[PDB]
Swiss-Prot record, chain B:
Stretches the record annotates as Disordered: 1-13
Similarity section: Belongs to the bacterial ribosomal protein bL27 family.
A single MF term (Gene Ontology): structural constituent of ribosome
Pfam families reported in the protein's UniProt record: Ribosomal_L27
Gene3D superfamilies reported for this sequence: 2.40.50.100
Keywords: Ribonucleoprotein, Ribosomal protein
Name assigned to this protein: Large ribosomal subunit protein bL27
Organism: Borreliella burgdorferi (strain ATCC 35210 / DSM 4680 / CIP 102532 / B31) (Borrelia burgdorferi)
Transmembrane segments: none
From Swiss-Prot, chain C:
Annotated keywords: Ribonucleoprotein, Ribosomal protein, RNA-binding, rRNA-binding, tRNA-binding
Protein name according to UniProt: Large ribosomal subunit protein uL5
Gene3D superfamilies: 3.30.1440.10
Cystine pairings recorded for this chain: none
Keyword Ribonucleoprotein among record annotations: yes
Subunit structure: Part of the 50S ribosomal subunit; part of the 5S rRNA/L5/L18/L25 subcomplex. Contacts the 5S rRNA and the P site tRNA. Forms a bridge to the 30S subunit in the 70S ribosome.
InterPro entries per UniProt: Ribosomal_uL5, Ribosomal_uL5_bac-type, Ribosomal_uL5_C, Ribosomal_uL5_CS, Ribosomal_uL5_dom_sf, Ribosomal_uL5_N
Gene Ontology biological process: translation
Gene: rplE
PROSITE patterns cross-referenced by the UniProt entry: RIBOSOMAL_L5
Any one GO molecular-function label of the UniProt entry: structural constituent of ribosome
Species whose genome carries this gene: Borreliella burgdorferi (strain ATCC 35210 / DSM 4680 / CIP 102532 / B31)
Keyword Heme in record: no
Swiss-Prot record, chain E:
Annotated protein name in UniProt: Large ribosomal subunit protein bL25
Function recorded in the entry: This is one of the proteins that binds to the 5S RNA in the ribosome where it forms part of the central protuberance.
Stored Pfam families: Ribosomal_L25p, Ribosomal_TL5_C
Keyword Amino-acid biosynthesis set for record: no
Keyword Ribosomal protein: yes
GO biological process: translation
Family (UniProt): Belongs to the bacterial ribosomal protein bL25 family. CTC subfamily.
The encoding gene: rplY
Gene Ontology MF annotations: 5S rRNA binding; structural constituent of ribosome
Protein source organism: Borreliella burgdorferi (strain ATCC 35210 / DSM 4680 / CIP 102532 / B31) (Borrelia burgdorferi)
An annotated GO cellular component: cytosolic large ribosomal subunit
Assembly with partners or alone: Part of the 50S ribosomal subunit; part of the 5S rRNA/L5/L18/L25 subcomplex. Contacts the 5S rRNA. Binds to the 5S rRNA independently of L5 and L18.
Swiss-Prot record, chain F:
Source organism (scientific name): Borreliella burgdorferi (strain ATCC 35210 / DSM 4680 / CIP 102532 / B31) (Borrelia burgdorferi)
Subunit structure, interactors included: Part of the 50S ribosomal subunit.
GO BP terms in the entry: translation
Ribosomal protein as UniProt keyword: yes
Name the UniProt record assigns to this protein: Large ribosomal subunit protein bL31B
Alphabetized PANTHER family for the sequence: 50S RIBOSOMAL PROTEIN L31, CHLOROPLASTIC, LARGE RIBOSOMAL SUBUNIT PROTEIN BL31C
Ribonucleoprotein keyword on record: yes
GO molecular-function terms, A-Z: structural constituent of ribosome
Source superkingdom: Bacteria
SUPFAM superfamilies for the chain: L28p-like
Lineage: Bacteria, Pseudomonadati, Spirochaetota, Spirochaetia, Spirochaetales
Record's keyword terms, sorted: Ribonucleoprotein, Ribosomal protein
GO cellular component, one term: ribosome
Amino acid sequence: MKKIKEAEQRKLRRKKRIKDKIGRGVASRPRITVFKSNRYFYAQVIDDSKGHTIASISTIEKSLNLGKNIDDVKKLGEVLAKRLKEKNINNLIFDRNGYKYHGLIASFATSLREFGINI
Amino acid sequence: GSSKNGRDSISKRLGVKRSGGQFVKAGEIIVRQRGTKFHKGKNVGLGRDYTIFALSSGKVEFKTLKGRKYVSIV
Amino acid sequence: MNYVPELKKYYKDSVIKELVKEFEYKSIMQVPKLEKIVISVGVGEAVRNKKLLDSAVLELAQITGQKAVKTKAKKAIAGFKIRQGQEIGAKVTLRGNAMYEFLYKLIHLALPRVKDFRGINGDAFDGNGNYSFGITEQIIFSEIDYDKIERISGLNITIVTTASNDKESKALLLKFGMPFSN
Amino acid sequence: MLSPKKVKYRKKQRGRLSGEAQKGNKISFGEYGLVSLETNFITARQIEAARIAMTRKIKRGGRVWIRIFPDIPYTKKPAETRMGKGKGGVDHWNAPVKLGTVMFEMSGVVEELAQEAMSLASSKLPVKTMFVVRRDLR
Amino acid sequence: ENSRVLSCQYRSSFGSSNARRIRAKSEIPAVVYGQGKDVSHLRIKSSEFNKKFAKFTDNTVLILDDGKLERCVFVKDAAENIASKLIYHIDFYEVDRNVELEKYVPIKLIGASIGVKEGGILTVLKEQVKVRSLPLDLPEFIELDLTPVNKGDSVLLKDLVLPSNVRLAENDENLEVVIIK
Amino acid sequence: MRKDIHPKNNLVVFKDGSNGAMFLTKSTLNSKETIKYIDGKEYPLVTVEITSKSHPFYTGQQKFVDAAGRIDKFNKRYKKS
RNA sequence: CCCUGGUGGUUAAAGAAAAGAGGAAACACCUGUUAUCAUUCCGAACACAGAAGUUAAGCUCUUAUUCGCUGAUGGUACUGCGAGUUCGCGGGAGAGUAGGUUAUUGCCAGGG
């Protein structure tokens, strides 16, 4: 009850502070946010001048058939990079979205980095 | 038995310097205050002493959200 | 091998079933379980005697198996002549396998070795399934040796349970065989 | 006497008191009330003089409620001084009353005896008064 | 039955100055709301109101007739100036004339009780009773004579002799209204 | 966790001298003696004189000696006057 | 498209409490601490590795509005001005009363 509620509350507070520390995204340099469920892994690129998701990816996508490991998110970030290049976006701001930059997120981010995306 | 007190500081001239709807250019001071009596919205910045100033030319506007006042340049 | 405490085995293989039947719970893990055991000791006299606090911390380490933390003064007070931030208490948290093993050790071995041990008041419940009670002579635990103690000391034990009421936790403790004075 | 037992500040500025009463203007705890017809200050000590009058007139018949409490210092400079130093010192306590304040309330006794007792009280206050029955019960 | 009827006519002034002028013409501004209708703004004759309802309680119910309609209204509020005995606004809450409704009604104690005569102790446990009736038949106050009530006697709620179409509503019927111990 | 501030926990078999029950319990106490538990596993054996089932509280209850029968004891000798 | 999840926009609480309903997918609970990682002790949180079990809680929806929040129409206070004087013109609360309220919506992903 109260313990789960306060865990949620802490997550929200962290999320909000992160958001206004990094600022909003613009069509030139939109914002990349992630979400880490118990099963999957989601990423969205958002332009807040419109509230529009320019691109997105997740491990639910059957064709990718990745898992939920460091290796899998490496490949997933590769796919995201190749999907964004054809929509000619190279600058992104990395909203860690209430998580700690470590492990899976670290591998995701570095994978977007080796392939010419400025985060 | 004289007066034990009688001591006052110099008035600091706080308050809103540009009224909502006025046209300002970059760098104008909008509010002088102690503390965020008014908070910062789009296109404004907060000085080290909570002064509100305009980052770009535009028109001042005040909004209210959950009872807090926000200053913006639109 | 995932080595498992015998208490965990006993719980998982019987107690879940008996409590489901006995409290007609609809879904299985509506069953109560244990989340943490907090062992606390408050040495206010440590403000004079650092040796007291050091001895308490060390003896807690031998008793449980993991190191303790010395809490500080929340508020500076004069009745006990307390200055805010001074080291006043020491506590240990036990969770999971260590928690189960320590509770087994306690119930079967240390509660027996208490002078005039006639059970434990089966009413020290905070109304929300948390059972807190004291032990005055740590020497009941055979882990610590008698010679090295610098002053006989006691300590409080709080057991935190997922139960929503006292009845559930008392039933779980009785199934565990906790010697309540009844 | 009647006086507050603790104050934030010992001396306060004499306002201008005006207008009728918009609150504390209805009979609440009793049967008969002593409304005022002016706006002025009633000292604590006149308050207790009126209270003695009412209570003594009433031979245990009923109860008396006092609907005002002074809580306002009244300062006065020493006897022989000039206009120099400032804000001399508290002397006695005043309560504020406006046209329509109930000011006094009585319970238990017959209406005639109450009216007599409460004229006896009004004889000692500095404001015009009016004795009112509930005007919505009998 | 007339003594429960009240004549009004509509007003369209709606100002502080306008209301003062009306009261100078010796009338009373008033509003009627309830039953989800649009509020009706009207004015009343002060002399008529004083003559008829000089003793109005929260439970008084009456009839408003604008010459063209009838309304059953409670006196929800009346803004009275005590010093000048001056009414200066009335709020009328309308109810449905044929819908049973509840209302706490005060008691009025009469007679000298034998028990208290002989050494009984008044304890007025209940100052009011929840009754039930159609609006036009609600009792203004329910009477109770204590004269036969001897020592060590409590008053049952059923013991209250009640007007014709008025009925008890208390969940606890056996609670005591006044005791004499 | 970090690992440098913990006494060495060890699986230990506690043997009651009275009832013979043995308890498997991870105690930091190093026992000089070793015992083969039922599970064919070697564990430091610590012999403890008092245990759970041999409570003087669970099983052997209080012996109320000469409290209520005071009348009986006085009757049996000093009653023949 | 609808459901679910994520992420915004518009501000009146879009607030908590209790009761009932579900859970395909999705979300969460949940499982182990062994690898990197974290706690002034604790795998609780954080972190990594996963699919045995469940709506129990979180979550969504439905309830008497139970608490809160919001709240008219009239009237009053107050007030600018006035050769009408407790009056003439204009502005108009707070409290209370009748009520109301358990949000709405943009585009991304999964499958209906």
